[PDB]
């Protein structure tokens, strides 16, 4: 019963954390390669 709504709630909070990570990534230092930034950004989110 709880997980039913937890799905959407997790979606929203995940989007929010994504935006926070995007802000800090664009603030740290403007990396051409996609995986490098992307994989690193994902790693930062999981890690910090």
């Amino acid at each position: 019963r709880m997980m039913k709504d937890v799905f959407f709630f997790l979606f929203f909070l995940s989007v929010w954390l994504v935006a926070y990570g995007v802000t800090t990534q664009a603030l740290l230092h403007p990396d051409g390669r996609l995986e490098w930034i992307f994989r690193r950004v994902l790693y930062r989110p999981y890690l910090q």
């Binding site: 997790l10 994989r39 994902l42 989110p45 999981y46």
Partner: peptide, 19 residues
């Protein structure tokens, strides 16, 4: 589980499972 995530050995879905 105790805050030790060695991305050097696991990274060359998962996030959803953790949460």
């Amino acid at each position: 589980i105790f805050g030790q995530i060695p991305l050097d050995e696991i990274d060359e879905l998962v996030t959803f499972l953790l949460v």
